[PDB]
């Protein structure tokens, strides 16, 4: 569950991880290092374009595209199962597993 949370992660590594997944509709959530306390939905769109959508944390709520959410998980759920953003969240990209010691 919620494999798509990468915590603190810069833009370049986020784009690397999404491009590694390689399919349009791949996504992750990271807490912006440039704007801490805010988050980014990073999303691989068509034609090798990564979009980085700011998500605003306001009043215990989370805002993206004027829609309001109670948790980052609720936000991911909505753009996966209710409506497109219009592109659709399809493949959650999990953080790289720990390496073989």
Swiss-Prot record:
Post-translational modification (record): The N-terminus is blocked. Phosphorylated by SRC and LCK. The phosphorylation SRC inhibits its ability to stimulate the Ras-GTPase activity, whereas phosphorylation by LCK does not display any effect on stimulation activity.
Which regions form coiled coils?
Answer: none
Which Cys-Cys disulfides exist here? none
What are the residue boundaries of the SH2 domain, all occurrences included? 4-93
Q: In which tissues is it expressed?
A: In placental villi, detected only in the trophoblast layer (cytotrophoblast and syncytiotrophoblast). Not detected in stromal, endothelial or Hofbauer cells (at protein level).
Q: Where in the cell is it found?
A: Cytoplasm
Q: Classify the source by domain of life.
A: Eukaryota
Function description: Inhibitory regulator of the Ras-cyclic AMP pathway. Stimulates the GTPase of normal but not oncogenic Ras p21; this stimulation may be further increased in the presence of NCK1.
What do we know about how this protein assembles, alone or with others?
A: Interacts with SQSTM1. Interacts with SPSB1; the interaction does not promote degradation. Interacts with CAV2 (tyrosine phosphorylated form). Directly interacts with NCK1. Interacts with PDGFRB (tyrosine phosphorylated). Interacts (via SH2 domain) with the 'Tyr-9' phosphorylated form of PDPK1. Interacts with tyrosine-phosphorylated EPHB4.
Instruction: Name the disease.
Output: Mutations in the SH2 domain of RASA seem to be oncogenic and cause basal cell carcinomas. Capillary malformation-arteriovenous malformation 1: A disorder characterized by atypical capillary malformations that are multiple, small, round to oval in shape and pinkish red in color. These capillary malformations are associated with either arteriovenous malformation, arteriovenous fistula, or Parkes Weber syndrome. CMAVM1 inheritance is autosomal dominant.
The name under which this protein is listed is Ras GTPase-activating protein 1
In which organism is this protein found?
Homo sapiens (Human)
Q: Which gene encodes it?
A: RASA1
Portion of the full-length sequence here? 178 to 280 of 1047
